[PDB]
Design an enzyme around this catalytic site. Structure first.
Site, PDB file in Angstrom:
ATOM      1  N   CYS A  63     -37.894  39.499  44.162  1.00 28.43           N
ATOM      2  CA  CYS A  63     -39.087  40.178  44.645  1.00 28.43           C
ATOM      3  C   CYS A  63     -38.470  41.070  45.726  1.00 28.43           C
ATOM      4  O   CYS A  63     -37.484  41.753  45.462  1.00 28.43           O
ATOM      5  CB  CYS A  63     -40.118  39.199  45.224  1.00 28.43           C
ATOM      6  SG  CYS A  63     -39.457  37.779  46.123  1.00 28.43           S
TER       7      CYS A  63
ATOM      8  N   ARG B 180     -42.389  35.313  46.492  1.00 26.96           N
ATOM      9  CA  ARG B 180     -42.902  35.411  45.144  1.00 26.96           C
ATOM     10  C   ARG B 180     -41.908  34.762  44.175  1.00 26.96           C
ATOM     11  O   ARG B 180     -42.318  34.026  43.292  1.00 26.96           O
ATOM     12  CB  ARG B 180     -43.194  36.882  44.816  1.00 26.96           C
ATOM     13  CG  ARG B 180     -44.475  37.367  45.558  1.00 26.96           C
ATOM     14  CD  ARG B 180     -44.690  38.861  45.498  1.00 26.96           C
ATOM     15  NE  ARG B 180     -43.795  39.578  46.414  1.00 26.96           N
ATOM     16  CZ  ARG B 180     -43.801  40.896  46.585  1.00 26.96           C
ATOM     17  NH1 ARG B 180     -44.666  41.642  45.910  1.00 26.96           N
ATOM     18  NH2 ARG B 180     -42.910  41.473  47.391  1.00 26.96           N
ATOM     19  N   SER B 181     -40.607  34.997  44.364  1.00 30.45           N
ATOM     20  CA  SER B 181     -39.593  34.389  43.489  1.00 30.45           C
ATOM     21  C   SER B 181     -39.616  32.848  43.554  1.00 30.45           C
ATOM     22  O   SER B 181     -39.442  32.175  42.540  1.00 30.45           O
ATOM     23  CB  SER B 181     -38.201  34.883  43.871  1.00 30.45           C
ATOM     24  OG  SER B 181     -38.097  36.288  43.752  1.00 30.45           O
TER      25      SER B 181
ATOM     26  N   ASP C 281     -47.377  41.175  48.110  1.00 32.72           N
ATOM     27  CA  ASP C 281     -46.399  40.540  48.976  1.00 32.72           C
ATOM     28  C   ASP C 281     -47.140  39.529  49.869  1.00 32.72           C
ATOM     29  O   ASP C 281     -48.221  39.818  50.372  1.00 32.72           O
ATOM     30  CB  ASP C 281     -45.682  41.593  49.823  1.00 32.72           C
ATOM     31  CG  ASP C 281     -44.301  41.144  50.245  1.00 32.72           C
ATOM     32  OD1 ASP C 281     -43.883  40.055  49.810  1.00 32.72           O
ATOM     33  OD2 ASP C 281     -43.631  41.871  50.993  1.00 32.72           O
TER      34      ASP C 281
ATOM     35  N   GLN D 161     -43.336  31.498  50.681  1.00 32.78           N
ATOM     36  CA  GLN D 161     -43.558  32.054  52.011  1.00 32.78           C
ATOM     37  C   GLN D 161     -44.896  31.808  52.711  1.00 32.78           C
ATOM     38  O   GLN D 161     -45.022  32.131  53.891  1.00 32.78           O
ATOM     39  CB  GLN D 161     -43.257  33.553  51.974  1.00 32.78           C
ATOM     40  CG  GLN D 161     -41.775  33.849  51.989  1.00 32.78           C
ATOM     41  CD  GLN D 161     -41.166  33.637  53.365  1.00 32.78           C
ATOM     42  OE1 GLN D 161     -41.428  34.403  54.292  1.00 32.78           O
ATOM     43  NE2 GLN D 161     -40.364  32.584  53.508  1.00 32.78           N
TER      44      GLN D 161
HETATM   45  O1  F32 Z   1     -44.284  36.562  49.096  1.00 35.15           O
HETATM   46  C1  F32 Z   1     -43.278  37.171  49.438  1.00 35.15           C
HETATM   47  C2  F32 Z   1     -42.881  37.481  50.869  1.00 35.15           C
HETATM   48  C3  F32 Z   1     -41.837  38.568  50.861  1.00 35.15           C
HETATM   49  C4  F32 Z   1     -40.905  38.677  52.084  1.00 35.15           C
HETATM   50  C5  F32 Z   1     -40.465  39.997  52.545  1.00 35.15           C
HETATM   51  C6  F32 Z   1     -39.568  40.124  53.690  1.00 35.15           C
HETATM   52  C7  F32 Z   1     -39.107  38.921  54.380  1.00 35.15           C
HETATM   53  C8  F32 Z   1     -38.180  39.047  55.560  1.00 35.15           C
HETATM   54  C9  F32 Z   1     -38.771  39.901  56.680  1.00 35.15           C
HETATM   55  N1  F32 Z   1     -37.684  40.249  57.593  1.00 35.15           N
HETATM   56  C10 F32 Z   1     -37.536  41.549  58.111  1.00 35.15           C
HETATM   57  N2  F32 Z   1     -38.415  42.641  57.915  1.00 35.15           N
HETATM   58  C11 F32 Z   1     -37.873  43.759  58.596  1.00 35.15           C
HETATM   59  C12 F32 Z   1     -38.544  45.068  58.590  1.00 35.15           C
HETATM   60  C13 F32 Z   1     -37.945  46.209  59.312  1.00 35.15           C
HETATM   61  C14 F32 Z   1     -36.668  46.040  60.044  1.00 35.15           C
HETATM   62  C15 F32 Z   1     -35.993  44.725  60.049  1.00 35.15           C
HETATM   63  C16 F32 Z   1     -36.602  43.587  59.322  1.00 35.15           C
HETATM   64  S1  F32 Z   1     -36.080  41.882  59.108  1.00 35.15           S
HETATM   65  C17 F32 Z   1     -39.860  39.119  57.409  1.00 35.15           C
HETATM   66  N3  F32 Z   1     -39.464  38.031  58.231  1.00 35.15           N
HETATM   67  C18 F32 Z   1     -40.756  37.619  58.598  1.00 35.15           C
HETATM   68  C19 F32 Z   1     -41.091  36.478  59.466  1.00 35.15           C
HETATM   69  C20 F32 Z   1     -42.529  36.196  59.717  1.00 35.15           C
HETATM   70  C21 F32 Z   1     -43.582  37.052  59.105  1.00 35.15           C
HETATM   71  C22 F32 Z   1     -43.202  38.198  58.237  1.00 35.15           C
HETATM   72  C23 F32 Z   1     -41.773  38.446  58.010  1.00 35.15           C
HETATM   73  N4  F32 Z   1     -41.223  39.463  57.209  1.00 35.15           N
HETATM   74  C24 F32 Z   1     -39.543  37.586  53.928  1.00 35.15           C
HETATM   75  C25 F32 Z   1     -40.447  37.465  52.774  1.00 35.15           C
HETATM   76  S2  F32 Z   1     -40.962  38.274  49.333  1.00 35.15           S
HETATM   77  O2  F32 Z   1     -40.457  39.687  48.619  1.00 35.15           O
HETATM   78  O3  F32 Z   1     -39.756  37.099  49.479  1.00 35.15           O
HETATM   79  N5  F32 Z   1     -42.410  37.602  48.522  1.00 35.15           N
END
Ligand code: F32
Ligand code: MG
Length: 296
Positions: A213, A219-220, A179, A260
């Site tokens: 993902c 990743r997607s 990730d 990302q």
């Molecule tokens: O390379 C990748 C990144 C992943 C990923 C996973 C989660 C999120 C959303 C997550 N939101 C959230 N994570 C949580 C966890 C617990 C309770 C509520 C929430 S909202 C997110 N937003 C962020 C902003 C700054 C840095 C890290 C972050 N991660 C974005 C991308 S993926 O599966 O798209 N592949």
């Protein structure tokens, strides 16, 4: 493409190039995704499909699924990018697969990654333990699977329990892509990409492949940007005219946050530059990627 790459790597300016893209990225409304009743249908509150490109389920009670149709007009390929299904949205996921006539599903994450839950177990792990998604009247059965070192291909049978029609769905699961990270090598990524291509699951005779993902953006986004850039290099008169940044922004018109991290952007350059060797006529690089990926 590599001149641009070398000038960027040379100046160590990937973080600035990547941030320019985020700042220039489209911003469209996601009102439907934000409705109170759809909260338990979104894995992440900060990752939503735009209303204009979201996939609509054919049911009436609620047609919402956190999914977007990324339609690349010039490349002539469509992709559905979605989040990793939630326990309560697995039936919705397969309903979408069914209604959109997708032939393949590309998963680039694992269920658990570094102690964190990222996606529900939406496909069966055992042949003798099929899954039934009552809410959507679908039956899902594991017919067989081919486990490689860094990815697994599964043959699934999805059945509409109402009309008894069945269809074979191919599951392409990349199990070693971290990730917020990149694949081990361009060769391992391209080997995987071309396996998906050779399966026919991306053919226009089928619905759009479904790619996901955890959030369906990082990743997607990388997987789709690479596939699209390579499609464009193969269709145009001059393959050096392909501008990955412009392509990424175009894709970002359909779903927010594709790619990302700056390093994922850089990897995309590398994957495209390497894959270009196959487009320009090298009928041997494909086997080489297979060998170098060490899939056995
Ligand atoms: O390379 C990748 C990144 C992943 C990923 C996973 C989660 C999120 C959303 C997550 N939101 C959230 N994570 C949580 C966890 C617990 C309770 C509520 C929430 S909202 C997110 N937003 C962020 C902003 C700054 C840095 C890290 C972050 N991660 C974005 C991308 S993926 O599966 O798209 N592949
Ligand atoms: Mg067994």
């Amino acid at each position: 493409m590599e001149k641009e790459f070398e000038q960027i790597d040379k100046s160590g300016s990937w973080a600035a190039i990547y941030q320019d893209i985020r700042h220039e990225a489209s911003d469209f409304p996601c009102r439907v995704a934000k409705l109170p009743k759809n909260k338990n249908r979104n894995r992440y509150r900060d990752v939503s499909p735009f209303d204009h490109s979201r996939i609509k389920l054919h049911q009436e009670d609620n047609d919402y699924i956190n999914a977007s149709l990324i339609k690349m007009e010039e490349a002539q390929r469509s992709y559905i990018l979605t989040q990793g299904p939630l326990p309560n949205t697995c039936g919705h996921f397969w309903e979408m697969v069914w209604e959109q006539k997708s032939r393949g599903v590309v998963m680039l994450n694992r269920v658990m990654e570094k102690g964190s839950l990222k996606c529900a177990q939406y496909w069966p792990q055992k042949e003798e333990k099929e899954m039934i998604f009552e809410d959507t009247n679908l039956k899902l059965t594991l017919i067989s699977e081919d486990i490689k070192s860094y990815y697994t291909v599964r043959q699934l049978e999805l059945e509409n329990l109402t009309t008894q029609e069945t269809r074979e769905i191919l599951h392409f699961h990349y199990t070693t892509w971290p990730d917020f990270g990149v694949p081990e090598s361009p060769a391992s990524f391209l080997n995987f990409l071309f396996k998906v291509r050779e399966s026919g699951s991306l053919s226009p005779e089928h619905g759009p492949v479904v790619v996901h993902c955890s959030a369906g953006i990082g990743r997607s986004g990388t997987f789709c940007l690479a596939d699209t850039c390579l499609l464009l290099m193969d269709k145009r008169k001059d393959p050096s005219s392909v501008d990955i940044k412009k392509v990424l922004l175009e894709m970002r018109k359909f779903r927010m946050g594709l790619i990302q991290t700056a390093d994922q952007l850089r990897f995309s350059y590398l994957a495209v530059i390497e894959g270009a060797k196959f487009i320009m006529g090298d009928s041997s690089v494909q086997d080489q990627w297979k060998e170098l990926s060490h899939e056995d």
